[PDB]
Amino acid sequence: AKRPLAVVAPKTSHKHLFLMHMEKVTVTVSPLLFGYGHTLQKAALDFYRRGLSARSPFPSDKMFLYYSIDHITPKIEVTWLDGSVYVPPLIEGVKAQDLIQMVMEQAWLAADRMSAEGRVLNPIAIDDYKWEQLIAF
């Protein structure tokens, strides 16, 4: 780090998992584990669908599913441009809009840490935080 990290962070709700600064979002599960109803297995796999959705501007070719074997609880691993991986903790009762919110919210912190070490950052297309917008009628 070239400077102490940020203090304040924007606080807004993220619909879609746009590639803010991540480089590879892998989602590991073990189908040997099973469950009917809302479990973590379901919460993580819809996050795959919700990421691969035709709606989210996430690059569909950059998300990697990974069937495990050894009863690996569903892992969601995001890797940023600097290569520091991040597993959003899958607390029980979680679901899609949380993980799409966790990783996107952390995306601003992690992209901040990359911007602290000295990594040059790119222009981002989406602006989840409405800043150039005004509500019109």
Binding site: T28, P31, D46, Y67, T73
Partner: protein
């Protein structure tokens, strides 16, 4: 005694203070068994050279079409809901646990191990 005797599996616990009820600060726990950081090297390679983990593209092509698939035998329209995750694993768990073809080539040495006792007994017998 390792809890999950599989030494590569490592149990990680994380308890968090998240805002529930809009104002509160409750205790939420994210318990999980994940692979030891030992088993992280050969997995941050994209081919999944680490075994026990299979690129989903292997068991079938284009999960972009296998998980994004929407029920439509005749449920077209608004009722073309996605598939329930409970079978969408099954059609992939059943594909994982298929018959892989044990070839008789391995069976020869194993057969060469089948007649192990019967013929090694007279070897030391006939060799005095």
């Amino acid at each position: 005694v390792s809890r999950l005797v599989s030494p590569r599996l490592r149990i990680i616990h994380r308890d968090y203070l998240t805002r529930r009820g809009g104002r509160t600060h409750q205790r939420c726990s994210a318990v999980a068994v994940d692979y030891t950081p030992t088993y992280f090297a050969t997995y941050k390679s994209d081919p999944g050279q680490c075994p026990r983990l299979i690129d989903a593209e292997a068991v079938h092509g284009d999960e972009q079409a296998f998980w994004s698939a929407r029920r439509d035998f005749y449920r077209g329209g608004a009722s073309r809901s996605y598939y329930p995750a409970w079978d969408r694993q099954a059609q992939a768990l059943i594909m994982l646990t298929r018959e892989v073809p044990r070839i008789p080539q391995e069976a020869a040495f194993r057969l060469f191990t089948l007649g192990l006792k019967m013929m090694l007994l007279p070897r030391l017998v006939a060799g005095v």
